[PDB]
Scaffold this motif. Structure first.
Motif, PDB file in Angstrom:
ATOM      1  N   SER A  68       0.824  -1.200   0.000  1.00 50.24           N
ATOM      2  CA  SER A  68       0.000   0.000   0.000  1.00 50.24           C
ATOM      3  C   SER A  68       0.863   1.257   0.000  1.00 50.24           C
ATOM      4  CB  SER A  68      -0.928   0.014   1.214  1.00 50.24           C
ATOM      5  N   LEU A  69       0.313   2.332  -0.568  1.00 46.22           N
ATOM      6  CA  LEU A  69       1.039   3.595  -0.594  1.00 46.22           C
ATOM      7  C   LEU A  69       1.146   4.208   0.797  1.00 46.22           C
ATOM      8  N   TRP A  70       0.208   3.881   1.690  1.00 47.98           N
ATOM      9  CA  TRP A  70       0.189   4.466   3.024  1.00 47.98           C
ATOM     10  C   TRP A  70       1.064   3.723   4.023  1.00 47.98           C
ATOM     11  CZ3 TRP A  70      -1.708   8.936   5.014  1.00 47.98           C
ATOM     12  CH2 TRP A  70      -2.593   9.676   4.221  1.00 47.98           C
ATOM     13  N   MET A  71       1.480   2.495   3.711  1.00 46.69           N
ATOM     14  CA  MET A  71       2.160   1.671   4.710  1.00 46.69           C
ATOM     15  C   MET A  71       3.432   2.302   5.259  1.00 46.69           C
ATOM     16  SD  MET A  71       3.711  -2.180   4.390  1.00 46.69           S
ATOM     17  CE  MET A  71       4.900  -1.567   3.200  1.00 46.69           C
ATOM     18  N   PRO A  72       4.382   2.785   4.445  1.00 49.57           N
ATOM     19  CA  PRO A  72       5.607   3.352   5.037  1.00 49.57           C
ATOM     20  C   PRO A  72       5.345   4.557   5.921  1.00 49.57           C
ATOM     21  CG  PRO A  72       5.894   2.924   2.693  1.00 49.57           C
ATOM     22  CD  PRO A  72       4.435   2.805   2.972  1.00 49.57           C
ATOM     23  N   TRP A  73       4.357   5.380   5.564  1.00 48.05           N
ATOM     24  CA  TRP A  73       4.032   6.546   6.377  1.00 48.05           C
ATOM     25  C   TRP A  73       3.524   6.129   7.752  1.00 48.05           C
ATOM     26  CZ3 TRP A  73      -0.131   8.823   8.781  1.00 48.05           C
ATOM     27  CH2 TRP A  73      -0.016  10.185   9.088  1.00 48.05           C
ATOM     28  N   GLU A  74       2.560   5.205   7.790  1.00 46.87           N
ATOM     29  CA  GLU A  74       1.971   4.787   9.060  1.00 46.87           C
ATOM     30  C   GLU A  74       3.011   4.144   9.969  1.00 46.87           C
ATOM     31  OE1 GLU A  74      -1.425   2.363   8.514  1.00 46.87           O
ATOM     32  OE2 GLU A  74      -2.587   3.904   7.460  1.00 46.87           O
ATOM     33  N   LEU A  75       3.816   3.228   9.425  1.00 51.98           N
ATOM     34  CA  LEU A  75       4.872   2.607  10.219  1.00 51.98           C
ATOM     35  C   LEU A  75       5.793   3.666  10.806  1.00 51.98           C
ATOM     36  CD1 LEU A  75       6.042  -0.311   7.831  1.00 51.98           C
ATOM     37  CD2 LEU A  75       4.234  -0.438   9.551  1.00 51.98           C
ATOM     38  N   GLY A  76       6.159   4.656   9.992  1.00 51.57           N
ATOM     39  CA  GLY A  76       7.069   5.688  10.456  1.00 51.57           C
ATOM     40  C   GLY A  76       6.445   6.611  11.483  1.00 51.57           C
ATOM     41  N   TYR A  77       5.174   6.976  11.289  1.00 52.92           N
ATOM     42  CA  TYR A  77       4.533   7.897  12.223  1.00 52.92           C
ATOM     43  C   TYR A  77       4.369   7.254  13.591  1.00 52.92           C
ATOM     44  CZ  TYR A  77       1.284  11.133  14.366  1.00 52.92           C
ATOM     45  OH  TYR A  77       0.677  12.020  15.225  1.00 52.92           O
ATOM     46  N   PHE A  78       3.838   6.031  13.627  1.00 57.76           N
ATOM     47  CA  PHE A  78       3.705   5.336  14.900  1.00 57.76           C
ATOM     48  C   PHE A  78       5.064   5.043  15.516  1.00 57.76           C
ATOM     49  CE2 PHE A  78       0.182   3.477  17.261  1.00 57.76           C
ATOM     50  CZ  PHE A  78       0.864   2.819  18.263  1.00 57.76           C
ATOM     51  N   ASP A  79       6.086   4.844  14.681  1.00 58.68           N
ATOM     52  CA  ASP A  79       7.444   4.696  15.191  1.00 58.68           C
ATOM     53  C   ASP A  79       7.885   5.952  15.933  1.00 58.68           C
ATOM     54  OD1 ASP A  79       9.882   3.579  15.714  1.00 58.68           O
ATOM     55  OD2 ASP A  79      10.600   3.582  13.639  1.00 58.68           O
ATOM     56  N   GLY A  80       7.445   7.115  15.469  1.00 54.16           N
ATOM     57  CA  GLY A  80       7.811   8.369  16.092  1.00 54.16           C
ATOM     58  C   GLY A  80       7.054   8.679  17.368  1.00 54.16           C
ATOM     59  N   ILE A  81       5.764   8.356  17.417  1.00 56.03           N
ATOM     60  CA  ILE A  81       4.951   8.778  18.551  1.00 56.03           C
ATOM     61  C   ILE A  81       4.969   7.766  19.695  1.00 56.03           C
ATOM     62  CG2 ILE A  81       3.508  10.198  17.086  1.00 56.03           C
ATOM     63  CD1 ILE A  81       1.384   7.693  17.698  1.00 56.03           C
ATOM     64  N   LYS A  82       5.129   6.475  19.396  1.00 50.41           N
ATOM     65  CA  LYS A  82       5.085   5.449  20.433  1.00 50.41           C
ATOM     66  C   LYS A  82       6.171   4.389  20.305  1.00 50.41           C
ATOM     67  CE  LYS A  82       0.666   6.340  22.283  1.00 50.41           C
ATOM     68  NZ  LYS A  82      -0.144   5.905  23.461  1.00 50.41           N
ATOM     69  N   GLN A  83       6.867   4.298  19.169  1.00 45.11           N
ATOM     70  CA  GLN A  83       8.071   3.476  19.023  1.00 45.11           C
ATOM     71  C   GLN A  83       7.796   1.986  19.222  1.00 45.11           C
ATOM     72  N   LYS A  84       6.615   1.514  18.812  1.00 46.36           N
ATOM     73  CA  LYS A  84       6.249   0.096  18.923  1.00 46.36           C
ATOM     74  C   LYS A  84       5.502  -0.301  17.650  1.00 46.36           C
ATOM     75  CE  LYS A  84       8.038  -0.715  22.963  1.00 46.36           C
ATOM     76  NZ  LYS A  84       9.310  -1.486  23.097  1.00 46.36           N
ATOM     77  N   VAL A  85       6.244  -0.777  16.652  1.00 44.82           N
ATOM     78  CA  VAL A  85       5.676  -1.192  15.374  1.00 44.82           C
ATOM     79  C   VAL A  85       6.072  -2.639  15.114  1.00 44.82           C
ATOM     80  CG1 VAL A  85       5.383  -0.626  12.952  1.00 44.82           C
ATOM     81  CG2 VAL A  85       5.975   1.177  14.578  1.00 44.82           C
ATOM     82  N   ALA A  86       5.086  -3.472  14.781  1.00 42.44           N
ATOM     83  CA  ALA A  86       5.321  -4.874  14.469  1.00 42.44           C
ATOM     84  C   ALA A  86       4.558  -5.264  13.212  1.00 42.44           C
ATOM     85  CB  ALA A  86       4.913  -5.788  15.632  1.00 42.44           C
ATOM     86  N   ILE A  87       5.114  -6.227  12.485  1.00 47.38           N
ATOM     87  CA  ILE A  87       4.537  -6.722  11.241  1.00 47.38           C
ATOM     88  C   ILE A  87       3.822  -8.035  11.525  1.00 47.38           C
ATOM     89  CG2 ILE A  87       4.990  -7.268   8.827  1.00 47.38           C
ATOM     90  CD1 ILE A  87       5.842  -4.578   9.133  1.00 47.38           C
ATOM     91  N   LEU A  88       2.641  -8.211  10.932  1.00 49.93           N
ATOM     92  CA  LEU A  88       1.869  -9.446  11.064  1.00 49.93           C
ATOM     93  C   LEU A  88       1.707 -10.061   9.681  1.00 49.93           C
ATOM     94  CD1 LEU A  88      -1.084  -9.964  13.480  1.00 49.93           C
ATOM     95  CD2 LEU A  88      -0.998 -11.181  11.302  1.00 49.93           C
ATOM     96  N   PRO A  89       2.614 -10.944   9.272  1.00 50.03           N
ATOM     97  CA  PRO A  89       2.447 -11.621   7.982  1.00 50.03           C
ATOM     98  C   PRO A  89       1.301 -12.616   8.036  1.00 50.03           C
ATOM     99  CG  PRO A  89       4.717 -11.783   8.816  1.00 50.03           C
ATOM    100  CD  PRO A  89       3.858 -11.339   9.950  1.00 50.03           C
ATOM    101  N   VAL A  90       0.491 -12.620   6.985  1.00 47.24           N
ATOM    102  CA  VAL A  90      -0.606 -13.569   6.841  1.00 47.24           C
ATOM    103  C   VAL A  90      -0.265 -14.460   5.654  1.00 47.24           C
ATOM    104  CG1 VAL A  90      -3.075 -13.895   6.643  1.00 47.24           C
ATOM    105  CG2 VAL A  90      -2.181 -11.860   7.764  1.00 47.24           C
ATOM    106  N   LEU A  91       0.329 -15.611   5.940  1.00 48.58           N
ATOM    107  CA  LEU A  91       0.708 -16.578   4.924  1.00 48.58           C
ATOM    108  C   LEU A  91      -0.411 -17.591   4.718  1.00 48.58           C
ATOM    109  CD1 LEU A  91       4.389 -17.083   6.069  1.00 48.58           C
ATOM    110  CD2 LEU A  91       3.548 -15.725   4.138  1.00 48.58           C
ATOM    111  N   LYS A  92      -0.319 -18.323   3.610  1.00 49.67           N
ATOM    112  CA  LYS A  92      -1.311 -19.345   3.305  1.00 49.67           C
ATOM    113  C   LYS A  92      -1.110 -20.608   4.131  1.00 49.67           C
ATOM    114  CE  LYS A  92      -0.783 -19.538  -1.240  1.00 49.67           C
ATOM    115  NZ  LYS A  92      -1.274 -19.804  -2.622  1.00 49.67           N
ATOM    116  N   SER A  93       0.108 -20.849   4.610  1.00 53.71           N
ATOM    117  CA  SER A  93       0.380 -21.908   5.571  1.00 53.71           C
ATOM    118  C   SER A  93       1.734 -21.628   6.204  1.00 53.71           C
ATOM    119  CB  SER A  93       0.372 -23.295   4.916  1.00 53.71           C
ATOM    120  OG  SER A  93       1.465 -23.459   4.030  1.00 53.71           O
ATOM    121  N   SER A  94       1.821 -21.821   7.519  1.00 56.40           N
ATOM    122  CA  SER A  94       3.067 -21.604   8.242  1.00 56.40           C
ATOM    123  C   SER A  94       3.289 -22.741   9.225  1.00 56.40           C
ATOM    124  CB  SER A  94       3.060 -20.265   8.984  1.00 56.40           C
ATOM    125  OG  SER A  94       4.270 -20.080   9.698  1.00 56.40           O
ATOM    126  N   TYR A  95       4.495 -23.307   9.206  1.00 56.34           N
ATOM    127  CA  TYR A  95       4.874 -24.356  10.143  1.00 56.34           C
ATOM    128  C   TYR A  95       6.081 -23.968  10.988  1.00 56.34           C
TER     129      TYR A  95
END
Lengths: 173, 164
Positions: B98-125
């Protein structure tokens, strides 16, 4: 008021680099900007964190010279997305009062652009877009105000062509 | 420990048609509590309304508050306003960005410094995620307790991650 020109920046470059050959003039300006990168002072408080889309290193330099000759401090952001370089940007964006992201008609965006524009909004809330035209109204590049030129010139921050304020007064808000 | 599979979200969705998931998420957006400190700001790209609501119910089921995200100056003020109410941002992305993703990650990184990624895969072991570009810039989420991973063998509980 007017906006910056690719002519304005390239001529300002020749206030510090030679006017011999495009290849040499390029190699020269890259040395000044690399030197400024190595000369970043952690204990300094810079007025402007200058970030840019892809521009001529000569034009980046002439922009750095133009802003300093107006009486402002400038740290120039000087390649992929790393945990390591993200840390350098945080430490050096915290060293600055405001952020200008310069764009030319040939390049509106960049890989790091929206993250830095988002991060500096979070830590300091002062982000402005710097339009560089090829020849006072400029309409992510519409999300923040823009920079313009005004017996001595000054930097003006524009919410619109109607709404302007001095950069000195824009930092204080 | 495994990563969130798309089937896991579709499962937890059955508890609560994507148009039906939209109305629930729209109600969740419309019923925004100003005085509440949410635990997770759920930002999401390339996940349907069904898989989103399933992820919301799974997190809240573990006991964590969730406010779910839902180009103009006016909207960026709502994003800043709603993001300030959360302790951490989870970004959920499926296997283009998404075009908005880098902005949101960066803004929340600035205000609260707690950003995590949640990958949604088709199968994970495995408890392993090597993401590239911005998806490798912050720790990632794995799953019962939610664990935050600076690396695959570097894991820490979500409640520890907040206080830390």
């Amino acid at each position: 008021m007017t906006l910056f020109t690719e002519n304005d920046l390239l001529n300002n470059s020749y206030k510090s680099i030679q006017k011999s050959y495009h290849f040499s003039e390029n190699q020269a300006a890259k040395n000044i900007l690399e030197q400024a990168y190595k000369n970043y002072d952690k204990n300094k408080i810079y007025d402007i964190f200058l970030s840019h889309s892809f521009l001529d290193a000569r034009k980046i330099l002439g922009l750095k010279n133009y802003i300093e000759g107006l009486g402002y401090s400038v740290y120039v952001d000087w390649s992929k997305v790393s945990k390591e370089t993200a840390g350098i940007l945080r430490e050096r964006m915290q060293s600055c009062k405001s952020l200008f992201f310069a764009i030319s008609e040939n390049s509106d965006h960049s890989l790091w652009m929206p993250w830095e524009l988002g991060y500096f909004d979070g830590i300091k809330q002062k982000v402005a877009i710097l339009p560089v035209l090829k020849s006072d109204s400029y309409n992510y590049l519409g999300l923040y105000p823009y920079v313009a030129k005004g017996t001595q010139e000054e930097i003006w921050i524009h919410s619109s062509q109607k709404q302007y304020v001095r950069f000195r007064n824009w930092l204080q808000q």
